[model samples]
Target: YPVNPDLMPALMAVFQHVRTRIQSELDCQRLDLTPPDVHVLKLIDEQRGLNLQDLGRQMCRDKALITRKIRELEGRNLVRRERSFQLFLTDEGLAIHQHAEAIMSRVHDELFAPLTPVEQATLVHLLDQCLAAQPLEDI
Candidate 1:
């Protein structure tokens, strides 16, 4: 029998496991990028003109920490910065993003493979409902 668990612990466990898997895959490919770093690449690729401040807000991260990461990206030649505070991916960055996104998408699909479309939608809705509640209010 499956020892299926519930609540936030299960959610956290899944979240950690998938990210670690992604990291391992990245390491195997010699990408040398962390999951959050890949996320920065993804965001920058999708929104080409967003600046460091905008990214910090979108990522819910600290400006100082994000500034460091952005600098690292620049140092690695994976990103380009404009005088207007905009960010864009270099050719290599785009190529790396392509591969990383493919891996990410495959793993994401695998995670939800057992669920039907309706069930997946339901899971999303449930998570959204839980997040929309007031912190510690009527829990």
Candidate 2:
């Protein structure tokens, strides 16, 4: 059985709304990147020397899809592969990553602006608790 079907819709709605707002931010910045592309870049930056297989595992995506995203980034000169098959961001990629970070920061701020500081803290705490309860196998 599903856990709280009513709660699931609220969670999904929040996710959809945030995704739409982030896409709008990307459009306004004139970036030719998609959310998955930015996610890949961010992951590469966070976990230096990541390989395609590991990246696919971390992203919970299929290898073919991950490869496609990496290829798109490579076509834009944003990333490169080494002899070891590790992924590394180019200078252009780093710059774009920083810009993407700033854009996301703004989007998050806007989304949470209506909440009080205490409310935000409580919300984050509750979310963290829920995340911690998730199964590692699923993750």
Candidate 3:
């Protein structure tokens, strides 16, 4: 079956809007990092020592792009690569991740500000349902 013509575009627009807002907030906070950078930091922080291949797989990104991002972070002393080829966050990286989390929390609140509590709950539930219906490989 064909998707509803309006649905995909609207979803894409929402994602784009949220991404723009996130980048703007990051800039305002003087984080000097992109959304992808934050994602990499968060993943490394969570995994403690993730390898480049696993990181790329988790991000669904290409190796070259991941390598470049890692290099940039390394230059800023935010992350370090061990001889075992595992990635670890530096103290600075952890601090930045914490700050970014706060900023992102505020951004999410602002984005959902117009929705009522009930509406927000319903939205989250529906999104989760949709996500749950998808296969792991599809995701």
Candidate 4:
């Protein structure tokens, strides 16, 4: 079935809350990292040995932007460049990842905690389907 246009507002409201909560909790804490940085760290932590190009694609960021962010984290001793032109998570990066993940999980729960299990499952499936349908350009 086609999505109802009337449901768009409610979907956007949820997205807005999730974005705002993650940004506020992670970036605002002066954890010495931004949302993008935290994302990069998490990506590197999960998919070790991914080159800059792959990392950029995963993060939906430009290569140059990812390069700059990597440099920033490098300066802070949170990330390191590998021989294969990939980024690796440092001990500091792991620490940040753990904390950021916790914050993200809490935000997700707080935003969706009121929903029933079936509703939550349905929402996740719908969101995943929507994401899969978007033909985003590879970075």
Candidate 5:
């Protein structure tokens, strides 16, 4: 049985609205990129220098898969593979990241505008708890 079936529709509606807003704002076209590729870009943007294994860990992905993504991005000139075996974003990638950040900020404001600061914090904490309670295998 589903948990809180009646509550799900309302939750899903809000979640979908937020997702669409974020997507529209961010204009991220990385959906065309492989899962590992997208994850690697995000990791590299967040971390100054990250190796394949660390990137994989951050994304809960396999190291070998991360390597493949790195190779793909490198081939596309979207990233640079350094002597430290760390990945860094290319200028183009940085531009994309900057734009994404702007859009995400807008989305966050729009989605949480209806809530007070405490309510927003509580909502985030509850959602994180619920999500972290699940095993990735169930996904």
Candidate 6:
């Protein structure tokens, strides 16, 4: 891809800034997971009991890739699967999920604190549009 210095350039810069901040905060808490790991865990916790295929669709990922991700989480004993292939969090996973959720919440609040309620509302709607518009049938 050529360097398209458009809206995405600045948007991506700020996005990564917050992402890095979140990772540093995770480090402070002595959590070893990456930002991507936290995202996977959070969604898995929300979509509890989803199988690998279902999770692949929701996360816009492939089964093989997701399988490896699950393998690593399970290595840390943060994830589990039943005989039916349904996913669930172990006790330690739930504990880490709560802590990660709190960190995410705090970062979001801080990031949006400068915006007016109207700006926040509008941005939220437009961001949802951006998210939904992604063409990722590659999943």
TM-score of each: 0.80, 0.88, 0.87, 0.79, 0.62, 0.79
Please name the candidate that would achieve the greatest lDDT relative to the true structure: 1
Per-residue lDDT of model 1, residues 68-95, tens digit only: 9999999999998895499999999999
- Model 4 earns a TM-score of 0.79
lDDT of 4: 0.82
Residue 14 lDDT in model 1? Answer: 90
Residue 102 lDDT, candidate 3, scale 0-100: 88
Residue 120's lDDT in candidate 4: 93
Give lDDT tens digits, candidate 4, residues 9-128: 987897788777888897676685566676778888999877888988887889999788788888989888874597788897888889999988999889888999999999889878
Model 6 per-residue lDDT tens digits across residues 1-139: 4665786987988789879988989999998878888988988899878788888887799999999999999889999988449889999999998998899988878988999999999988978876755577875
Which pairs, if any, clash in model 2? none
Query: lDDT of each structure?
Result: 0.91, 0.88, 0.88, 0.82, 0.72, 0.87
Compose the digit string of candidate 5's lDDT tens values, residues 1-139.
5588767798889777866766554445443443334445777998988887788888897888777877878887888878448888999888765656566677768778999989998998987876755567854
Query: Order of candidates by TM-score, top first?
Result: 2, 3, 1, 4, 6, 5
**Per-structure clash totals for the candidates:** 0, 0, 0, 0, 0, 0
lDDT of 2 by residue, 89-135 (tens): 99999999998888888888998899999999999998888774556
TM-score of 1: 0.80
In candidate 1, list every pair of residues with a backbone clash: none
State the lDDT at 14 in candidate 2. Answer: 84
TM-score of 2: 0.88
